[PDB]
Amino acid sequence: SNAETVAAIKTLIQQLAQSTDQFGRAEINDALRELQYSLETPFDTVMRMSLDTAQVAVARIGSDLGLFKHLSQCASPQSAEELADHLGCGRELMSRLLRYMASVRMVQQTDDIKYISSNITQTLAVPGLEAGMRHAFENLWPVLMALPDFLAERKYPDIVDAKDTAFQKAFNTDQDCFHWLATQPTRIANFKVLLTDERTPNFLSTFPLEKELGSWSAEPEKALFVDIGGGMGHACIRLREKYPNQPGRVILQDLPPVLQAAQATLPLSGIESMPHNFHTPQPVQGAKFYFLRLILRDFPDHQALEILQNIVPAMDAESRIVIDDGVPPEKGARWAETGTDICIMSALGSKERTQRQWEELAAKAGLQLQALYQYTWPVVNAAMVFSLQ
């Protein structure tokens, strides 16, 4: 029975996935993807490429309607008619959307053709994760749609500049992405929500802080941790939580509107909010750790170098710059890393960097790599610790 074999495959893979940790499950997931691509027919390859696109548009519709939040609060299965009337959607349209969503697990369909939430329903109901999906639709899609004709018209140049990539064609502007976004309040509002998502795990799961501290003294009143472009301060909060007895100033640096958003959820004491533009010289002198998490991947080499050169004059011999970012391998990189590389090339002119490419960038700022502490697998995020040469 082919149905019996499929059911047994599902049982065994679900059991193997429970038998391991999140990194093992991520490896299983990538294997399932590779198996699919290798087992599909040629026609199914093109069908998959033609249709998987629709998931983002339909998630965006469900988000607009409030469907995922509503369904995640429902105590019993709901009919399409009930959902349509409650959310203000045409009954036929709602039925067709829900049938599509159930087929890609965006919701679950029951045996009597009613609907309940799935894991994906709950995910899309979370404001920060919903904002990530809406970002993909409104900011990533236009840039990817413009990229092939941009490259064709320009005879396939290497993209190296934030002011000369697919973004300018997609949005009919000469500004770079970050400058243009600052003029679009609806997009700024979505980014504000996006900043509330906290990635897990984080670098403190593997970072040997006491080892890296050595004999560094916080006395008289030195800074332990300067979180440069720290957003909502999640790194600062987790640091104080994990190391509540380590002395030294912990400083969140970001732009004033972001620091105001962060205030509601920062601890009452122990974390300073310091307005600071990281394109200017670093004001905090002689801190133990200057921390840059997912900052430098958004910038081409010239601008990333300037950010580092703004920090180096503040360092003393014991200071370290900690770059927490993606470190793809030299070969066999996975779709999350290479896909991110193509997207930030097209929107920002930047790139993902291997360890050798990080070291080459840091060397231009007078820095040398002392240690690298991986904390995710198989897609590598790592805290890279640099000192003065």
Added chain:
Amino acid sequence: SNAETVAAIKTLIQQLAQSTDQFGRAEINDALRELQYSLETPFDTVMRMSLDTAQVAVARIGSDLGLFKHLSQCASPQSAEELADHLGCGRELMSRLLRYMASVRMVQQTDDIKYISSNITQTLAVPGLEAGMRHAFENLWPVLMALPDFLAERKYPDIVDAKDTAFQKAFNTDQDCFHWLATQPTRIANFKVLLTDERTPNFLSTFPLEKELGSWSAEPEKALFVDIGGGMGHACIRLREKYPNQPGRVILQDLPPVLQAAQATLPLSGIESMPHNFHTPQPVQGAKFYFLRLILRDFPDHQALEILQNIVPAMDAESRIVIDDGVPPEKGARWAETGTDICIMSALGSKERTQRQWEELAAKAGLQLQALYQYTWPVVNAAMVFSLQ
């Protein structure tokens, strides 16, 4: 070992897949997709939705460069430098594109970071399949990108009309999709290549021709088979190949430029080419089978009914209309059926139809279902045989 477990999963799934037939492999692939969606983390759900989009854009770039056709005929692994110089691409751009393609199996990357064809490379090198991918990029993507805001601004109506759906917003026109496309030479040229793809299996694998004929007789120059909108005539060719001694005319009906393109590959005798617009009265009277394959799914009910009403006056008591099309189930429909439904809703105002919906449509034309012969699974395509009521 995580690597050892992952390799063992791949080995066992591959062995199970090779032991079943194409329909069993399709069921396995659908299960792998379901497992992937159920095992991903919330962040990975959003990352998947954010990035899987890039596959179509990068395939379009590879098609523009001629990369897949070139790699499919190479007899040894090629470096990114060699490919860039041969195809006229910037070397860094080519390297980043190839790394992305390898991570989604669009090519294969070797242990010394060179590149060879994968199954997907060969697929994208086939002109008809390449054309399907280009169609997804240039025709489906803009309509899907317009659908969420189209529905929002119109307060979520049921889409019922080809002249009032997302297409009009996407391409800034009041024309319906088919009328507009016929004004766009480059898009027409891609559709001509798309028609060269022949789907397998086909309805003749399960259609009981002898039983359906009964004592039918061709005595007065009558037609056995009229292929309405038959494209390149694949159904006529396969019919003559499988039943070479069955009497009766076999007639391919389409518009003149498609019949012209079909001539090169049609047999030199046995199949007549007859220009005919299926929005006009059917000229062939009393044929045994009037055959409509993947025609009516492109039209809303009102227009699909008019196509049928142009045939019914030509029928005698022995005539049958054979609708060969998708028959999604009442529940548990799969992503290929529901995804198609949402795309053709957005571009064409049409829909996929359950068996009951096909019967309701045909009844408005005065037709009754006599037999239904499935020939694919689990996504069902079937030849539905209708007679006069």
Added chain:
Amino acid sequence: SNAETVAAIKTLIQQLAQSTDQFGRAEINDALRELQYSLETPFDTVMRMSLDTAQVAVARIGSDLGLFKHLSQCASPQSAEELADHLGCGRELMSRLLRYMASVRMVQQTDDIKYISSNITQTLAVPGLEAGMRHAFENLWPVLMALPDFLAERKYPDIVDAKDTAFQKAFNTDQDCFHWLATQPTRIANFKVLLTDERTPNFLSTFPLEKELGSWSAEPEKALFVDIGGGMGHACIRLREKYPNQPGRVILQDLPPVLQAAQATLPLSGIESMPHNFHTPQPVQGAKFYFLRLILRDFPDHQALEILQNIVPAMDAESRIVIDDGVPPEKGARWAETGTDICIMSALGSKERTQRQWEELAAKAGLQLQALYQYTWPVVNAAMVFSLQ
């Protein structure tokens, strides 16, 4: 590749087995046995039955030579020549024995044809487990070899009497098994070593001692626990270890030579050693628990009933008899339970008993079942708690 498929099966089963507990692994092992029996060819069925017998004979030879104890303490692989010379075995004989042992995992053979311990080597080096294997060879095998012709010559009677079963034919005696064994010094010495094996888990993992005690009070030098035929006293030791502050005497009852052997490993206080023959009236009056673990399965109903009838006059209203023994199900019993049933039928005239059969036996002694506490699965051992009717 057959080798690759086989390796992948092993990897996946190993991973599934390590992800469950000991009871889950027992269920997996029973499924592997069932699969093996269902997938063997008819010839392989007979070959398996013909040859699996040799494992006991070869283990006995390895035990006689001291091979498993020696190999378990070796720090490097040993050649067959080295083992033969050390153990005093002909070199060709030793080589052929070791090749056989490696093929059934009794040792492991290395890639350069030397030998190291396997899990089974270590098992057969443990004195109590080695003694169980020697018992199978010298006591169980002769009775099983005599059973078919014993039943044939007697026209297939129900075996009901310890003095009239296959044992008498196998050892050419009119004595029952236990009486005869007590005349055979070498066999007695092996049983003494066998008693040093402690089964895990034990009944204290699920026995709700506090609930079963209720308001029981030890005030007049009363006994909490009387271990009847307790052997080395493992149940008394575990009880004192788990409930060190519970008042009440804890008493180990057995025959003098077994109590003597127990002294070396008993705690120096807290457990009394009391010589007592359980075929005679119980001397300890009004104890809370009279405990019989794996005693009554060795006796037919008439003798098991007499053992219980020697205890019941010592009971007061609060006393309980706790029978800790196998409780096979009414259907679907597993090979360990039914195999034991056939062996003890042939040697001892006794039987395994379902819960209903235990209740019927105990009712003849005027006892009623109050509670049953399983502590192993899927082959069930349980502590059955009986009170006066």
Added chain:
Amino acid sequence: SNAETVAAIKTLIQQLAQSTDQFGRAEINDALRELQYSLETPFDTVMRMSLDTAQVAVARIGSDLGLFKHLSQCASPQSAEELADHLGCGRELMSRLLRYMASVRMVQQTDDIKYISSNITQTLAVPGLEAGMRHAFENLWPVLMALPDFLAERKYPDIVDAKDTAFQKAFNTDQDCFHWLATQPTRIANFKVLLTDERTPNFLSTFPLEKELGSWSAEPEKALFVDIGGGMGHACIRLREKYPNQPGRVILQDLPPVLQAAQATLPLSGIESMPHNFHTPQPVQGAKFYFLRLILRDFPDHQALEILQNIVPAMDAESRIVIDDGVPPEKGARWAETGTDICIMSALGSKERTQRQWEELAAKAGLQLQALYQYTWPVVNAAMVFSLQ
């Protein structure tokens, strides 16, 4: 759910086993055995060794009762009571035997505690396979039971002589096994039935007969195939069946009582029956193939050599001796090969021989190996083709 996981393991292994051929299934079976042995607890190891022995005794009882033949003819499930009354067995004994048999798949137990035949029931109902089981019980078991004390009393000698092994102790005789068996009519009768079993596959599945023939001429009246000790002539029958047009005499040689048994099932023409004792000079001169299947493994080197030396003088330059027998590997031999080695050592003083050991034996007869044609895996049986040196 652990029950769900076990069910899925069974489904997937059953599907993998159907996806391959008999050799692949044999490899899977050996892997299942290895997994069991590696996953059992120490206690379960000794329990398995103690109890698996009982299968042979219980199969022997079922054979005595006619149970397997009766159940294999039953059209519906049978109760233990019905089976007991029909076969003349005590009702309790029958119930306990059937429960044991169901737990080792010797029969199947239904949900309402009735019994139906399994694959093993059908196997044990086949006369030749039943005879193999009865041989294991009455001839192999006594020799294995005597082997440990035989070796101990003799200080572990290398066994080299058919008149000085465990057989003489087991059966209290000074005769060798084959000479003693000739005086025991009940054992001779079982061997007669055993000879009717035909092993599959056979050497003709891979033997390149036309290649090995070369230009050999059967003219004037030469012998193609001389089946030395050919038993019922299965090799001769299959040869004539597969190669019906190859000329040349095909001659079955065996002892007169065996040739008389063979007559009923030999073809009416084309195969000669020739009484011949293979301890005397071969009478047929200059045959192309002198065939010895599973003959020489029953003899120590001295006697096996004499059998070959009786053939060599009959050979001309084109003659070949074909030894069809087991060829275990130099390392990693499997339980069927090593177990057979231990059994024939104990009963016959002989041995299984590697390819090098076959070549060394044949070289003493003036023979050289020309080709080796395997036809079973993973346990190797092969047709080894030898010519004059």
